[PDB]
Amino acid sequence: AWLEAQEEEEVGFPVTPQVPLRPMTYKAAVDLSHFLKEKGGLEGLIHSQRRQDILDLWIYHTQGYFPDWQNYTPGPGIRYPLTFGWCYKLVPVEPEKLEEANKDDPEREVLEWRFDSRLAFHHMARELHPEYFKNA
């Protein structure tokens, strides 16, 4: 679909600018998670590095929601979603090929978006570092 960029990508020409900034509901994240899923399937898509901006940006020229919800725990390697409802967890399933030798492009470990709508009720990121969210 839109992720299957054969060669010369073509985002057609849909005119969708800053649309009425509605309130990003936690439910909005889960609904959005499944919306992007049926819109082709972002799951298993290896997040290179710029694809991240396309996501937040795409949401801009579409729902106009600001990326004040898209976030993740610091530190490299795995990366759990800080916000709740967002059932997306980045994880490097690639083999640690830290073979230092080729002086070409940086062959670092890339990450892939692991879709898991079960996060709609479970709470793993909370057991990791919840001290960031000060609710009560």
Curated annotation (Swiss-Prot):
The lineage of its organism: Viruses, Riboviria, Pararnavirae, Artverviricota, Revtraviricetes. The record marks 2-3 as: Cleavage. Residues 7-10 are annotated as: Acidic. It comes from the Viruses. The gene is nef. A motif (Diacidic) lies at residues 104-105. Transmembrane segments: none annotated. It comes from Human immunodeficiency virus type 1 group M subtype B (isolate LW123). The chain holds residues 56 to 205 of 206 of the full protein. Residues 14-23 are annotated as: SH3-binding. Residues 53-69 are annotated as: Mediates dimerization, Nef-PTE1 interaction. This is C-terminal core protein. A motif (PxxP) lies at residues 17-20.
